């Protein structure tokens, strides 16, 4: 699709068999979702945002469906104000900015 | 232009005949520029994101040019490490996300 920015670019994602809403965020290097139990192994990690550094859990090789397009990659789980799809997954689904 | 997301979407903006680098961010409701001394009265504001909130100064009707495209609007000045172009200015130039 072609998504305009008059509103927040929120889409439906499917992960862990759950539907959630997530923001497409090109200012984000990685994908950060709110607290959820994902299957497998995780490793603690620190990330920064405009407010500072937070701690997250890192899950590798997670399948996520974004607007029905499949992505397999890293997901950080932590205290984010919103579910955000960063560049690691935007590139997998061949998302671009245009003007 | 068609900006890919393999790298951070950094472009050149011009602000009062000053060229600067800015990240094009679809996950940003507002535009945030690095600390700078703009003539004018501002209004204090607090913006949030990963990590919490920071205090910024709000200036209205600032003219910026994103890759030779004029946008005039509300800008927040705070201690960001980078200039961030948000949705408020991204819509004025025709920016869309495509996948
Ligand atoms: C900051 C702009 C804007 C004001 C704000 N938007 C956000 O904070 C977005 C969402 C959390 C909503 C946010 O992801 C945004 O895209 C920011 C932009 C970033 C600010 C730091 C400087 C570089 C650029 N990105 C992020 O916060 C992600 C989080 C992440 C994932 N992996 C690693 N980090 N950061 C990054 O990818 C890269 O970070 C950094 C890179 C280099 C230096 C840094 C120094 C300090 C801190 C961070 C640095 C907003 O709209 N907030 C209102 C709001 C919206 C929805 C919900 C609640 N509140």
mmCIF file of C-alpha atoms and ligand atoms in Angstrom:
data_model
loop_
_atom_site.group_PDB
_atom_site.id
_atom_site.type_symbol
_atom_site.label_atom_id
_atom_site.label_comp_id
_atom_site.label_asym_id
_atom_site.label_seq_id
_atom_site.Cartn_x
_atom_site.Cartn_y
_atom_site.Cartn_z
ATOM 1 C CA UNK A 1 0.000 0.000 0.000
ATOM 2 C CA UNK A 2 0.616 3.732 -0.116
ATOM 3 C CA UNK A 3 0.362 5.139 3.453
ATOM 4 C CA UNK A 4 0.040 8.864 3.957
ATOM 5 C CA UNK A 5 1.225 10.525 7.217
ATOM 6 C CA UNK A 6 -1.729 12.775 7.957
ATOM 7 C CA UNK A 7 -2.305 10.213 10.775
ATOM 8 C CA UNK A 8 0.113 7.916 12.682
ATOM 9 C CA UNK A 9 1.048 5.029 10.369
ATOM 10 C CA UNK A 10 -0.459 2.190 12.458
ATOM 11 C CA UNK A 11 -0.945 -1.261 10.991
ATOM 12 C CA UNK A 12 -2.040 -4.630 12.199
ATOM 13 C CA UNK A 13 0.626 -7.182 12.995
ATOM 14 C CA UNK A 14 0.372 -10.825 13.818
ATOM 15 C CA UNK A 15 2.908 -12.214 16.279
ATOM 16 C CA UNK A 16 2.889 -15.148 18.639
ATOM 17 C CA UNK A 17 -0.555 -15.825 17.159
ATOM 18 C CA UNK A 18 -1.792 -12.429 18.415
ATOM 19 C CA UNK A 19 -3.024 -9.415 16.437
ATOM 20 C CA UNK A 20 -1.611 -6.060 17.682
ATOM 21 C CA UNK A 21 -1.356 -2.584 16.290
ATOM 22 C CA UNK A 22 2.221 -1.226 15.648
ATOM 23 C CA UNK A 23 3.581 2.025 14.248
ATOM 24 C CA UNK A 24 5.777 1.973 11.071
ATOM 25 C CA UNK A 25 8.697 4.054 12.264
ATOM 26 C CA UNK A 26 11.556 4.941 10.050
ATOM 27 C CA UNK A 27 13.343 6.791 12.970
ATOM 28 C CA UNK A 28 13.686 3.371 14.660
ATOM 29 C CA UNK A 29 16.626 1.047 13.907
ATOM 30 C CA UNK A 30 14.911 -1.976 15.442
ATOM 31 C CA UNK A 31 11.509 -3.343 16.280
ATOM 32 C CA UNK A 32 10.347 -2.813 19.791
ATOM 33 C CA UNK A 33 7.068 -4.256 21.147
ATOM 34 C CA UNK A 34 5.412 -3.991 24.505
ATOM 35 C CA UNK A 35 5.692 -6.681 27.095
ATOM 36 C CA UNK A 36 4.611 -10.110 25.811
ATOM 37 C CA UNK A 37 5.867 -13.694 26.217
ATOM 38 C CA UNK A 38 7.518 -14.892 23.043
ATOM 39 C CA UNK A 39 8.701 -18.467 22.694
ATOM 40 C CA UNK A 40 12.425 -19.215 22.973
ATOM 41 C CA UNK A 41 15.598 -17.659 24.284
ATOM 42 C CA UNK A 42 16.117 -13.980 24.988
ATOM 43 C CA UNK A 43 19.058 -11.840 25.985
ATOM 44 C CA UNK A 44 18.854 -8.561 27.956
ATOM 45 C CA UNK A 45 19.892 -5.429 26.064
ATOM 46 C CA UNK A 46 19.839 -1.613 26.399
ATOM 47 C CA UNK A 47 18.424 0.777 23.805
ATOM 48 C CA UNK A 48 18.003 4.501 23.553
ATOM 49 C CA UNK A 49 15.208 6.837 22.533
ATOM 50 C CA UNK A 50 14.604 10.593 22.976
ATOM 51 C CA UNK A 51 13.911 10.086 26.684
ATOM 52 C CA UNK A 52 17.000 7.881 27.394
ATOM 53 C CA UNK A 53 17.909 4.193 27.758
ATOM 54 C CA UNK A 54 15.719 1.380 28.669
ATOM 55 C CA UNK A 55 16.275 -2.263 29.087
ATOM 56 C CA UNK A 56 14.678 -4.821 26.773
ATOM 57 C CA UNK A 57 14.698 -8.506 26.140
ATOM 58 C CA UNK A 58 16.037 -9.504 22.659
ATOM 59 C CA UNK A 59 14.388 -12.335 20.673
ATOM 60 C CA UNK A 60 16.010 -13.502 17.457
ATOM 61 C CA UNK A 61 14.382 -15.051 14.427
ATOM 62 C CA UNK A 62 10.758 -14.230 15.224
ATOM 63 C CA UNK A 63 8.148 -14.533 12.516
ATOM 64 C CA UNK A 64 5.929 -11.484 12.273
ATOM 65 C CA UNK A 65 3.243 -10.698 9.698
ATOM 66 C CA UNK A 66 2.797 -7.018 8.859
ATOM 67 C CA UNK A 67 -0.329 -6.222 6.814
ATOM 68 C CA UNK A 68 -0.008 -9.819 5.749
ATOM 69 C CA UNK A 69 3.665 -9.514 4.576
ATOM 70 C CA UNK A 70 6.027 -11.994 6.387
ATOM 71 C CA UNK A 71 9.185 -10.897 8.181
ATOM 72 C CA UNK A 72 11.582 -13.103 10.233
ATOM 73 C CA UNK A 73 13.936 -11.102 12.405
ATOM 74 C CA UNK A 74 14.785 -9.580 15.719
ATOM 75 C CA UNK A 75 12.206 -8.296 18.101
ATOM 76 C CA UNK A 76 13.023 -6.333 21.327
ATOM 77 C CA UNK A 77 10.268 -6.653 24.059
ATOM 78 C CA UNK A 78 10.149 -3.803 26.666
ATOM 79 C CA UNK A 79 8.588 -0.587 27.991
ATOM 80 C CA UNK A 80 7.874 1.237 24.763
ATOM 81 C CA UNK A 81 5.010 3.788 24.648
ATOM 82 C CA UNK A 82 3.797 1.915 21.465
ATOM 83 C CA UNK A 83 4.562 -1.216 19.372
ATOM 84 C CA UNK A 84 7.015 0.058 16.745
ATOM 85 C CA UNK A 85 8.214 -1.582 13.524
ATOM 86 C CA UNK A 86 11.750 -0.335 12.895
ATOM 87 C CA UNK A 87 14.024 -0.522 9.870
ATOM 88 C CA UNK A 88 15.175 -4.166 10.397
ATOM 89 C CA UNK A 89 11.606 -5.341 9.464
ATOM 90 C CA UNK A 90 10.601 -2.443 7.184
ATOM 91 C CA UNK A 91 13.395 -3.521 4.855
ATOM 92 C CA UNK A 92 12.281 -7.153 4.810
ATOM 93 C CA UNK A 93 8.762 -6.125 3.561
ATOM 94 C CA UNK A 94 10.306 -3.716 1.022
ATOM 95 C CA UNK A 95 9.010 -0.563 2.564
ATOM 96 C CA UNK A 96 10.305 2.774 1.201
ATOM 97 C CA UNK A 97 9.727 6.487 1.879
ATOM 98 C CA UNK A 98 8.756 8.514 -1.239
ATOM 99 C CA UNK A 99 7.909 12.125 -2.032
ATOM 100 C CA UNK B 1 12.923 10.599 -4.395
ATOM 101 C CA UNK B 2 12.581 7.039 -3.197
ATOM 102 C CA UNK B 3 14.492 6.672 0.112
ATOM 103 C CA UNK B 4 15.372 3.042 1.032
ATOM 104 C CA UNK B 5 15.661 2.050 4.745
ATOM 105 C CA UNK B 6 18.856 0.020 4.686
ATOM 106 C CA UNK B 7 20.508 3.027 6.361
ATOM 107 C CA UNK B 8 18.851 5.621 8.668
ATOM 108 C CA UNK B 9 16.868 8.017 6.442
ATOM 109 C CA UNK B 10 19.106 11.053 6.778
ATOM 110 C CA UNK B 11 18.662 13.939 4.319
ATOM 111 C CA UNK B 12 19.689 17.563 4.085
ATOM 112 C CA UNK B 13 17.352 20.274 5.297
ATOM 113 C CA UNK B 14 17.936 23.962 5.035
ATOM 114 C CA UNK B 15 16.926 26.273 7.875
ATOM 115 C CA UNK B 16 17.571 29.932 7.315
ATOM 116 C CA UNK B 17 20.382 29.299 4.758
ATOM 117 C CA UNK B 18 22.015 26.764 7.166
ATOM 118 C CA UNK B 19 22.275 23.238 5.723
ATOM 119 C CA UNK B 20 21.793 20.409 8.253
ATOM 120 C CA UNK B 21 21.205 16.654 8.382
ATOM 121 C CA UNK B 22 17.826 15.380 9.683
ATOM 122 C CA UNK B 23 16.279 11.948 10.045
ATOM 123 C CA UNK B 24 12.963 11.421 8.289
ATOM 124 C CA UNK B 25 10.791 9.870 10.888
ATOM 125 C CA UNK B 26 7.336 8.469 10.366
ATOM 126 C CA UNK B 27 7.148 7.463 14.039
ATOM 127 C CA UNK B 28 7.569 11.136 15.079
ATOM 128 C CA UNK B 29 4.396 13.226 15.558
ATOM 129 C CA UNK B 30 6.508 16.381 15.802
ATOM 130 C CA UNK B 31 9.697 17.782 14.366
ATOM 131 C CA UNK B 32 12.605 18.071 16.845
ATOM 132 C CA UNK B 33 15.703 20.122 16.036
ATOM 133 C CA UNK B 34 19.000 20.242 17.865
ATOM 134 C CA UNK B 35 19.519 23.058 20.347
ATOM 135 C CA UNK B 36 19.639 26.389 18.411
ATOM 136 C CA UNK B 37 18.953 30.102 19.039
ATOM 137 C CA UNK B 38 15.880 31.045 17.017
ATOM 138 C CA UNK B 39 14.450 34.548 17.261
ATOM 139 C CA UNK B 40 11.030 34.425 18.864
ATOM 140 C CA UNK B 41 8.763 33.546 21.688
ATOM 141 C CA UNK B 42 8.262 29.876 22.307
ATOM 142 C CA UNK B 43 6.065 27.836 24.574
ATOM 143 C CA UNK B 44 7.621 25.122 26.770
ATOM 144 C CA UNK B 45 6.562 21.530 26.001
ATOM 145 C CA UNK B 46 7.501 18.019 27.106
ATOM 146 C CA UNK B 47 7.826 15.240 24.460
ATOM 147 C CA UNK B 48 7.953 11.545 25.048
ATOM 148 C CA UNK B 49 9.194 8.322 23.599
ATOM 149 C CA UNK B 50 11.437 5.407 24.485
ATOM 150 C CA UNK B 51 13.011 6.277 27.804
ATOM 151 C CA UNK B 52 10.509 8.977 29.001
ATOM 152 C CA UNK B 53 10.192 12.668 28.284
ATOM 153 C CA UNK B 54 12.418 15.700 27.732
ATOM 154 C CA UNK B 55 11.740 19.417 27.855
ATOM 155 C CA UNK B 56 11.729 21.347 24.601
ATOM 156 C CA UNK B 57 10.859 24.803 23.289
ATOM 157 C CA UNK B 58 8.125 25.177 20.765
ATOM 158 C CA UNK B 59 8.490 27.705 17.923
ATOM 159 C CA UNK B 60 5.589 28.044 15.393
ATOM 160 C CA UNK B 61 5.730 28.781 11.663
ATOM 161 C CA UNK B 62 9.299 27.768 11.018
ATOM 162 C CA UNK B 63 10.196 27.362 7.390
ATOM 163 C CA UNK B 64 12.315 24.409 6.581
ATOM 164 C CA UNK B 65 13.225 22.923 3.243
ATOM 165 C CA UNK B 66 13.487 19.128 3.035
ATOM 166 C CA UNK B 67 15.366 18.198 -0.158
ATOM 167 C CA UNK B 68 14.238 21.419 -1.897
ATOM 168 C CA UNK B 69 10.596 21.113 -0.729
ATOM 169 C CA UNK B 70 9.189 23.913 1.509
ATOM 170 C CA UNK B 71 7.394 23.075 4.738
ATOM 171 C CA UNK B 72 6.422 25.649 7.356
ATOM 172 C CA UNK B 73 5.246 24.528 10.686
ATOM 173 C CA UNK B 74 5.769 23.873 14.328
ATOM 174 C CA UNK B 75 9.266 22.898 15.483
ATOM 175 C CA UNK B 76 10.481 21.764 18.980
ATOM 176 C CA UNK B 77 14.130 22.708 19.987
ATOM 177 C CA UNK B 78 15.757 20.453 22.588
ATOM 178 C CA UNK B 79 18.919 18.481 23.355
ATOM 179 C CA UNK B 80 18.519 15.932 20.577
ATOM 180 C CA UNK B 81 21.575 14.326 19.123
ATOM 181 C CA UNK B 82 19.910 14.654 15.690
ATOM 182 C CA UNK B 83 17.403 16.781 13.869
ATOM 183 C CA UNK B 84 14.141 14.824 13.452
ATOM 184 C CA UNK B 85 11.534 15.633 10.801
ATOM 185 C CA UNK B 86 8.186 14.429 11.923
ATOM 186 C CA UNK B 87 4.727 13.883 10.363
ATOM 187 C CA UNK B 88 3.756 17.557 10.741
ATOM 188 C CA UNK B 89 6.298 18.444 8.075
ATOM 189 C CA UNK B 90 6.426 15.149 6.179
ATOM 190 C CA UNK B 91 2.801 15.606 4.990
ATOM 191 C CA UNK B 92 3.544 19.075 3.551
ATOM 192 C CA UNK B 93 6.051 17.574 1.136
ATOM 193 C CA UNK B 94 4.068 14.596 -0.173
ATOM 194 C CA UNK B 95 5.812 11.965 1.876
ATOM 195 C CA UNK B 96 4.197 8.498 1.937
ATOM 196 C CA UNK B 97 5.380 5.001 2.999
ATOM 197 C CA UNK B 98 5.043 2.383 0.233
ATOM 198 C CA UNK B 99 5.182 -1.408 0.422
HETATM 199 C C1 LIG C 1 11.154 11.683 19.182
HETATM 200 C C2 LIG C 1 10.279 12.154 18.053
HETATM 201 C C3 LIG C 1 8.794 12.085 18.505
HETATM 202 C C4 LIG C 1 8.596 13.324 19.396
HETATM 203 C C5 LIG C 1 8.268 10.869 19.210
HETATM 204 N N1 LIG C 1 8.450 9.571 18.602
HETATM 205 C C6 LIG C 1 9.135 8.558 19.150
HETATM 206 O O1 LIG C 1 9.790 8.689 20.196
HETATM 207 C C7 LIG C 1 9.153 7.239 18.387
HETATM 208 C C8 LIG C 1 8.279 6.173 19.005
HETATM 209 C C9 LIG C 1 8.789 5.644 20.384
HETATM 210 C C10 LIG C 1 6.797 6.661 19.119
HETATM 211 C C11 LIG C 1 10.615 6.801 18.180
HETATM 212 O O2 LIG C 1 10.766 5.489 17.880
HETATM 213 C C12 LIG C 1 11.530 7.642 17.241
HETATM 214 O O3 LIG C 1 11.232 7.149 15.952
HETATM 215 C C13 LIG C 1 12.952 7.647 17.761
HETATM 216 C C14 LIG C 1 13.855 8.614 17.000
HETATM 217 C C15 LIG C 1 15.302 8.698 17.576
HETATM 218 C C16 LIG C 1 15.316 9.595 18.874
HETATM 219 C C17 LIG C 1 16.771 9.496 19.410
HETATM 220 C C18 LIG C 1 17.723 10.180 18.444
HETATM 221 C C19 LIG C 1 17.707 9.464 17.092
HETATM 222 C C20 LIG C 1 16.273 9.251 16.544
HETATM 223 N N2 LIG C 1 13.604 6.369 17.808
HETATM 224 C C21 LIG C 1 13.852 5.633 18.909
HETATM 225 O O4 LIG C 1 13.614 6.051 20.027
HETATM 226 C C22 LIG C 1 14.689 4.389 18.614
HETATM 227 C C23 LIG C 1 14.424 3.334 19.645
HETATM 228 C C24 LIG C 1 15.321 2.170 19.293
HETATM 229 C C25 LIG C 1 15.160 0.962 18.735
HETATM 230 N N3 LIG C 1 16.451 0.344 18.727
HETATM 231 C C26 LIG C 1 17.332 1.236 19.198
HETATM 232 N N4 LIG C 1 16.684 2.328 19.592
HETATM 233 N N5 LIG C 1 16.050 4.821 18.451
HETATM 234 C C27 LIG C 1 16.848 4.559 17.428
HETATM 235 O O5 LIG C 1 16.582 3.747 16.551
HETATM 236 C C28 LIG C 1 18.239 5.135 17.366
HETATM 237 O O6 LIG C 1 18.611 5.710 18.575
HETATM 238 C C29 LIG C 1 19.714 6.468 18.765
HETATM 239 C C30 LIG C 1 20.642 6.565 17.781
HETATM 240 C C31 LIG C 1 21.790 7.368 17.941
HETATM 241 C C32 LIG C 1 22.002 8.062 19.090
HETATM 242 C C33 LIG C 1 21.115 7.952 20.167
HETATM 243 C C34 LIG C 1 21.333 8.678 21.362
HETATM 244 C C35 LIG C 1 20.411 8.559 22.356
HETATM 245 C C36 LIG C 1 19.266 7.755 22.205
HETATM 246 C C37 LIG C 1 19.019 7.078 21.058
HETATM 247 C C38 LIG C 1 19.931 7.129 19.996
HETATM 248 C C39 LIG C 1 6.709 10.961 19.316
HETATM 249 O O7 LIG C 1 6.017 11.035 18.311
HETATM 250 N N6 LIG C 1 6.127 10.862 20.481
HETATM 251 C C40 LIG C 1 4.764 10.975 20.843
HETATM 252 C C41 LIG C 1 4.174 9.656 21.196
HETATM 253 C C42 LIG C 1 3.771 8.861 20.123
HETATM 254 C C43 LIG C 1 3.197 7.612 20.323
HETATM 255 C C44 LIG C 1 3.070 7.188 21.645
HETATM 256 C C45 LIG C 1 3.496 8.003 22.695
HETATM 257 N N7 LIG C 1 4.035 9.221 22.472
#
